[PDB]
Design a protein around this ligand. Structure first.
Ligand SMILES: [Ca+2]
Length: 348
């Protein structure tokens, strides 16, 4: 109705993320069941690349993010996140990197450099998004594995935003490096299940989003050492309609508020800021996928504030998993379906 939509590729089995390859070489796409594939205009979709880690493809888990290292032009390094099982059948998020071959057929010498520990998931709340800040660091979004209180526990990597160096090492200036019992990898805590994350190109700061329970999805601007409240503070309720048992309220001293929340959850997903002159009407916007509402949320970004303009893609009836702004100034969208799609989207 308001946007143009081109289906670039169909029949994608639960795609989770995409990464644009430089010099018009197309893109990599993760399929959550465990396949990494290459798509390129005129060539279509490749067979699965070799060298990809085995994954625990159950519930919300599987093969999750794919992100190019900032120095990809020289290193050809690509990072992946995925769920990995432990010793009691429960799982946790894992993060590693390998080198993408020149011919795009394989990932070489993949190694896992970071693991969410303990592994507490039976299928839910892995997080998984990886974002490089472009100045030496890698941010890693971790859900609380559906064990609500653990998000507050600094000895556990549940419900945490992690910051590593861009090599996967622990930074010497991380907030809890000298805090007894605490995991040094932690940047922020008190998050439920983070989904989309992206660098705001106007503030050069990380923004993230997260699923609430029954309502209470959020956009946060996470800061060093800060508590985003979950499950002591929530804008949602339990699925029963009754309060989350651990919750003290919506606004709780010692915890940080989101910059936006929805009491009716879209089930927010991948997010992309738009800062291109290709489509000037989309300048200063943030586009957020909605899994439950089956569309994309269009928002106006105003410094550290954000407002909802409306929705696009609602008429297509597809759950939306990821949204990215391409180097060409188009929006690229992945749907969360058995017969999923890669869409190229532009305004009318
Ligand atoms: Ca919160």
């Amino acid at each position: 109705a308001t946007v143009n939509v081109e289906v670039l590729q169909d029949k994608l089995d639960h795609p989770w993320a995409l990464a644009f390859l430089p010099d018009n070489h197309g893109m990599l796409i993760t399929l959550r069941g465990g396949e990494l594939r290459h798509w390129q205009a005129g060539k279509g979709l490749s067979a699965p690349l070799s060298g990809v880690p085995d994954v625990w493809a159950h519930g919300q888990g599987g093969l999750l993010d794919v992100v190019l290292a900032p120095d990809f032009a020289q290193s050809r390094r690509i990072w992946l996140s995925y769920s990995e099982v432990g010793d009691d059948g429960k799982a946790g998020t894992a993060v590693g990197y390998g080198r993408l071959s020149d011919d795009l057929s394989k990932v070489t010498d993949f190694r896992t450099v970071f693991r969410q520990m303990p592994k507490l998931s039976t299928g839910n709340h892995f997080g998984g998004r990886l974002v490089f800040d472009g100045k030496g660091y890698l941010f890693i979004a971790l859900g609380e594995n559906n064990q609500r209180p653990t998000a507050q526990d600094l000895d556990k990597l549940q419900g945490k935003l992690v910051r590593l160096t861009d090599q996967g090492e622990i930074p010497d200036d991380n907030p809890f490096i000298k805090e007894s019992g605490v995991r040094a990898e932690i940047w922020s805590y008190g998050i439920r299940n983070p989904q989309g994350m992206a660098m705001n190109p106007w503030s050069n700061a990380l923004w993230l989003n997260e699923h609430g329970p029954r309502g209470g999805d959020e956009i946060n601007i996470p800061q060093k050492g800060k508590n985003y409240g979950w499950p002591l503070a929530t804008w949602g309720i339990n699925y029963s309609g009754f309060k989350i048992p651990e919750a003290k309220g919506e606004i709780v001293a010692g915890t940080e508020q989101p910059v936006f929340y929805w009491k009716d959850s879209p089930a927010v997903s991948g997010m992309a800021f738009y800062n291109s002159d290709k489509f000037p009407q989309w300048q200063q916007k943030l586009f957020i996928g909605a899994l439950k509402d089956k569309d994309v949320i269009v928002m106006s970004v105003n410094g550290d504030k954000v407002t909802e303009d409306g929705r696009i893609l609602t008429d297509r009836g597809q759950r939306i998993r990821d949204v990215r702004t391409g180097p060409d100034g188009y929006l690229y969208v992945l749907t969360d379906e058995s017969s999923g799609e890669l869409l190229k989207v532009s305004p009318r």
